[PDB]
Design a protein around this ligand. Structure first.
Ligand code: HEM
Ligand SMILES: CC(C)CCC[C@](C)(O)[C@H]1CC[C@H]2[C@@H]3CC=C4C[C@@H](O)CC[C@]4(C)[C@H]3CC[C@@]21C
Ligand code: FES
Lengths: 472, 26
């Protein structure tokens, strides 16, 4: 029979002492490197209590497979305690992210019909393509202004604005104008608050809420203010749309966006719809933008791969005779390159599931209700699970050797509670990259290795300044 | 049919990726 839980290797049983050593040796912002180091110390499985929360950490795709196979109908991941506390104390209506069991399932099913299903997502293409085409126009404009036949700059802020325009366009069916020269300052304030919400989450992460206010008073206050901006503005957007819908009529044969559909025909109350709009808006700005920045970075770092991807896109646009829907079926190397970007640069350091039943992993008995985390960042850099892991190689995902990709594509999670925005995200990034590849060559002057920082979501440790050349 | 016919699980290019991490509804 399997060894008991307590035999799983760990730094020890004192959550507070472990937390002390984590902060002193590695730091709150390098949690991803903490995992890498831990697997080097303990082997392919370990357990670690940080503060009051203990998790079993796993890296092997084979163990990942067992975990997700034993998943129940209503999976639970780790809830971020300052987010929970904010919603509870300020009585903020919660969406799919913070719900569980039947209440979660009910929202998820209604939302899948409108954001995941092919019948719905086929409508996103022109809405997303329009925003990407505008982004290209922004860069061409900056090139002309430069007078140099190129443009060099850190475009992270522009990527955030791009991600915002994209998510709002598919939700509201309306352009917010964030790619214009003169921007809406209140919409900019919304974008900034999302980042601030993530950033301020970090100093509170491994603490019960009773300790937040005692030791992180300023951070908690800043965090509360960030969420308040998120909610006040998402509320206004939704409420304005609700009333404008009644002012204009609800007789439309053309596609009007996700919100129109939900308000017009779903099992969701207005309360649930509005809560989920807020979460979709906030979940879609920092995610696709940082991911796309990493993709551009990997293309500049590997010019041969960039050439291959551009050639694939040009051939796809030609064969499809310009049709975007048809193109998206002829660009498998680009799609693989998105998987490759997420393997090296996951947004989420880990995936987590609480066990519903006892489960054996690595001949250790892991009891029901144990939090299990898959160290997705560590997995992506691990040379025993990926050949030459530091190398950006999209063809990796095209192997007929199904062993090479077995439970490796984890950047959007797995199963029924995988990323709700996955289809929006994939479509947005694929279309963005098609437009960029057709229009520009991407380089980085004085290229150097850019590391990663943990700001709740993973992000580049330092700015990346790109150089764009108009492609002929 | 856990996700209920939306291509958001695998209990029953995009289907190709669900197929790896193992349909009915598609
Ligand atoms: C590159 C872009 C993105 C990445 C890498 C990403 C990643 C993730 C991951 C790893 C999870 C957890 C999955 C799991 O537990 O198995 C998640 C959940 C979630 N994501 Fe995303 N995401 C992205 C874009 C988006 C977008 C655009 C939206 C907006 C619709 C969004 C909304 C959500 C929501 C609401 C959840 C919670 C879903 C639930 O609990 O049912 N994401 N995402
Ligand atoms: C702002 C919200 C409405 C939506 C946020 C969507 C995100 C960015 O898509 C969230 C959803 C679940 C989140 C994860 C939940 C739990 C953990 C474990 C923790 O130890 C590190 C953060 C990490 C890995 C989170 C990273 C950010 C994620 C992955
Ligand atoms: S039922 Fe979820 S994928 Fe077919």
């Amino acid at each position: 029979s399997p060894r008991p839980f307590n035999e799983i290797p760990s730094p020890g049983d004192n959550g507070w002492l472990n937390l002390y050593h984590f902060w002193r040796e590695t730091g709150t912002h390098k949690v991803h490197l903490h995992h890498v180091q831990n697997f080097q110390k303990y082997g392919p499985i370990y357990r670690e209590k940080l503060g009051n929360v203990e998790s079993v950490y796993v890296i092997d795709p084979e163990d990942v497979a067992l975990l997700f196979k034993s998943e129940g109908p209503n999976p639970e991941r780790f809830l971020i305690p300052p987010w929970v506390a904010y919603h509870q104390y300020y009585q903020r209506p919660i969406g799919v992210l913070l719900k569980k069991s039947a209440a979660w399932k009910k929202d998820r099913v209604a939302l899948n019909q409108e954001v995941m299903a092919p019948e719905a997502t086929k409508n996103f293409l022109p809405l997303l393509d329009a925003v990407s085409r505008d982004f290209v126009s922004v860069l061409h404009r900056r090139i002309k202004k430069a007078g140099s036949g190129n443009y060099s700059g850190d475009i992270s802020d522009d990527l955030f604005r791009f991600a915002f325009e994209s998510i709002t366009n598919v939700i509201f069916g309306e352009r917010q104008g964030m790619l214009e020269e003169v921007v809406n300052p209140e919409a900019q304030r919304f974008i900034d608050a999302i980042y601030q919400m993530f950033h301020t989450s970090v100093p509170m992460l491994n603490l019960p809420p009773d300790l937040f206010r005692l030791f992180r008073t300023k951070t908690w206050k800043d965090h509360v203010a960030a969420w308040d901006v998120i909610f006040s503005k998402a509320d206004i957007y939704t409420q304005n749309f609700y009333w404008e819908l009644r002012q204009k009529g609800s007789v439309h044969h053309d596609y009007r966006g996700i919100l129109y559909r939900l308000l017009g025909d779903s099992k969701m109350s207005f309360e649930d719809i509005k809560a989920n709009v807020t979460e979709m808006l906030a979940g879609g700005v920092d995610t696709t933008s940082m991911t796309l920045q990493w993709h551009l970075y990997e293309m500049a770092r590997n010019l041969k791969v960039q050439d291959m991807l551009r050639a694939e896109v040009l051939a796809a646009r030609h064969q499809a005779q310009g049709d975007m829907a048809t193109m998206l079926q002829l660009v498998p190397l680009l799609k693989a390159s998105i998987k490759e970007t997420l393997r090296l640069h996951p947004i989420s350091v880990t995936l987590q599931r609480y066990l519903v039943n006892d489960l054996v992993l690595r001949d250790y008995m892991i009891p029901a209700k144990t939090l299990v985390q898959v160290a997705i960042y560590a997995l992506g850099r691990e040379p025993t699970f990926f050949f030459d892991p530091e190398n950006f190689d999209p063809t990796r995902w095209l192997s007929k050797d199904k062993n090479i990709t077995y439970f490796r594509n984890l950047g959007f999670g797995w199963g029924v509670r995988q990323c709700l925005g996955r289809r929006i995200a994939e479509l947005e990034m694929t279309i963005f990259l098609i437009n960029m590849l057709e229009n520009f060559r991407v380089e980085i002057q004085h290229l150097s290795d850019v590391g990663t920082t943990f700001n709740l979501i993973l992000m580049p440790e330092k700015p990346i300044s790109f150089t764009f050349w108009p492609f002929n | 049919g856990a996700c209920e016919g939306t291509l958001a699980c695998s209990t029953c290019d995009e289907e190709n990726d669900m197929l790896d991490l193992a349909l009915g509804c598609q």
